Design a protein around this ligand. Sequence first.
Ligand SMILES: Nc1ncnc2c1ncn2[C@@H]1O[C@H](COP(=O)(O)O)[C@@H](OP(=O)(O)O)[C@H]1O
Length: 288
Amino acid sequence: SRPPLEYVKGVPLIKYFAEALGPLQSFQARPDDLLISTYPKSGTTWVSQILDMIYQGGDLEKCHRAPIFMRVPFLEFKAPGIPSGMETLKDTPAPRLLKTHLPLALLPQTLLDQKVKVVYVARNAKDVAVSYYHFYHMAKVHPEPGTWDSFLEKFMVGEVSYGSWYQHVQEWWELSRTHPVLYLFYEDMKENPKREIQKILEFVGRSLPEETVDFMVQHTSFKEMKKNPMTNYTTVPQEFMDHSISPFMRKGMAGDWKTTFTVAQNERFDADYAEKMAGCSLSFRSEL
Ligand SMILES: Nc1ncnc2c1ncn2[C@@H]1O[C@H](COP(=O)(O)O)[C@@H](OP(=O)(O)O)[C@H]1O
């Protein structure tokens, strides 16, 4: 009941996800698999619906079969009573969509050997941090988040579930130079979802009619995804995720961080950030 984190190979993880790593050594990847990789709260559920909808040929009826966590297995998941992501995985048919937030230090090597295709979504660190703070509150398996200010301090030293945002985004960027990785930016998806859905289609080697594409742009919108109980996580026990404290689908905005970040916090973050992202051509947008 709100246990602390357990560290493994330098990554802080939720108690259960760490345990789940045991059985996960048994996981065998297929060359037709597709891995969805992101640092938490960077748009995983967004791109999962996009991808599942593509995989279902656009049929919103086939997408309603089960919640997105039953449809896109969560590689390292485990909970009391709720079946592990590995358990779920036994029933999931090929081509499979898989989700993870594991850094490379922990990624099943099966996945890199099998040349598995990666769709990676990155989001600006300020928005991620805010999103993560609210998530910590509602997602009961997380430690106590404490105050925004303290939580932000942790976030800068990567002392939060899954560790440092900064390393996560650079390492998977680097990986994209020697591995098939489509590296997406949440803010581009905000800017122009259609442009971004087209690039995914191209990447996944599929082709769909203009009508179907536009149909997807809408059913993958924040507002549609908020109403859809197969994607908003409301079918889970309130003891596990308490939407009354904070909804999973909270705002879905680029730039909203500015209503949480104080000026002092903003100034300290920018200074810290310039150092951490020094020798990197990664370029983020904070707004619009
Ligand atoms: N279709 C969509 N369009 C835009 N944002 C979405 C979305 N579906 C979910 N989100 C937002 O993405 C974040 C969760 O990401 P993840 O899927 O990685 O956990 C939350 O951000 P906010 O808390 O900033 O609103 C959530 O509201």
